[PDB]
């Protein structure tokens, strides 16, 4: 199961997401994490070095819900 | 919250570097000033640096990871993209920094900096254009500099 | 374990009731199978499985996370 | 062909769940061999003008299902707005407001609630709903009576 944190894993915090959001890539972050890179002028993804814009974000939450399924399984 | 969202990753990279170090290196902070770090990357294996302790200053801002660490030698080098003082000529601590790279990725890419050289983007002129001219001569004054100001 | 059914709700695509395969998502965020919403997508005017909010074709991303976890769980179901 | 393994791998899949957990008061399942031709069984709603009643139905898949809905219509004669006396349903979902999200468990359960309360609003049959907004009781005495002769 540390495979599966793996995947809910926000690259910017390396924390479980929290409102996890993508962008024209396909890469997912927090909203607060990939927010905060869209202060900075030419914003381009942490991990593939594509263009995105802040407009273009989309809401993740199949992932939301999994980090809550993880975070029950962790109290065991 | 500038303060508290760094010095919580720089936790975070100083507990997995300690459990899994990159290979030849080593790193953490210098004491209660987590901002301010002392590394040691062993001279890679068959390279002219083989067998050389050089340490290294990795200073943090209170933007990590957004913007990258000063990263610099004090152990003198012969290297074309590492200058007299220790600067370092390397994309990622510069103009191509991402805040997915962690400190770990950053030692490592600093031994594949002395394990293949960039002369095409040279810090010492003279040092790049031996490399390309003269390979014999150039390994043959960077193993002087190892053997006496990394040992 | 018992509670893995609810992991694999979470990577059933809405339209097959499969797990995802090439999980894609859409203007309002919802996923599906690439082949399953392009289906819904070549008919006309197309709007969300799920929220009937409105998609393009055009728009689709790759829901990478999804796909990588679907193999996390198939890995476990041979055991 | 690929279409056909396709709605067939996803009626076979509720074929399995309708079984296993039916809606309340519906039963439903292939005819025969065909996986696309179904025959089902409701049980007027519990409180409704049609308590007591039972009425069958013929669902219908076709090779683009789910991408488009099911044929579903009435064999057994009701008293009712929303369904004609060829058996025809008026519901949302069986025509332009249809979702490839959507069951045919959720289709039951929603002529369920068609059953329960109708929508004089468009209704298949004028008289009917005309007479449930002006004479409820007159309305209500004759789908008690349509249900005793037709569904028992
Ligand atoms: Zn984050
Ligand atoms: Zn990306
Ligand atoms: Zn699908
Ligand atoms: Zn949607």
Redesign the interface.
């Known amino acids: 199961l540390t495979?599966?944190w793996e995947?809910?894993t926000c690259?910017?915090?390396?924390?479980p997401f929290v409102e996890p959001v993508?962008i024209?890539?396909?890469?997912?972050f927090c909203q607060e994490?990939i927010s905060?890179?869209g202060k900075?002028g030419g914003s381009?993804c942490?991990?593939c070095?594509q263009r995105f814009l802040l407009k273009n974000l989309?809401?993740?939450?199949?992932?939301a819900?999994?980090v809550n399924?993880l975070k029950?399984?962790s109290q065991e | 919250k500038l303060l508290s969202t760094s010095a919580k990753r720089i936790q975070k990279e100083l507990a997995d570097i300690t459990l899994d170090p990159p290979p030849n290196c080593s790193a953490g902070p210098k004491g209660d000033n987590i901002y301010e770090w002392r590394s040691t990357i062993l001279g890679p294996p068959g390279s002219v640096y083989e067998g050389g302790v050089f340490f290294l200053d990795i200073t943090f801002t209170p933007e990590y990871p957004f913007k990258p660490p000063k990263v610099t030698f004090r152990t003198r080098i012969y290297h074309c993209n590492i200058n007299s003082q220790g600067v370092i000529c390397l994309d990622i601590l510069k103009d191509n920094w991402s805040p997915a790279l962690t400190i770990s990725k950053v030692l490592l890419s600093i031994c594949s900096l002395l394990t293949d050289c960039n002369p095409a983007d040279p810090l010492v002129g003279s040092i790049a254009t031996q490399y390309m001219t003269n390979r014999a001569e150039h390994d043959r004054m960077a193993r002087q500099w190892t053997k006496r100001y990394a040992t």
Do not use: A, F, K, Y
Request: glycine share 6%; charged share 20%; hydrophobic share 30%.
């Open positions: 495979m599966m995947e809910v690259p910017i915090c390396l924390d993508s024209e890539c396909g890469h997912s994490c905060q890179v900075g381009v942490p991990v070095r989309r809401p993740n939450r199949q992932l819900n999994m399924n029950e399984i």
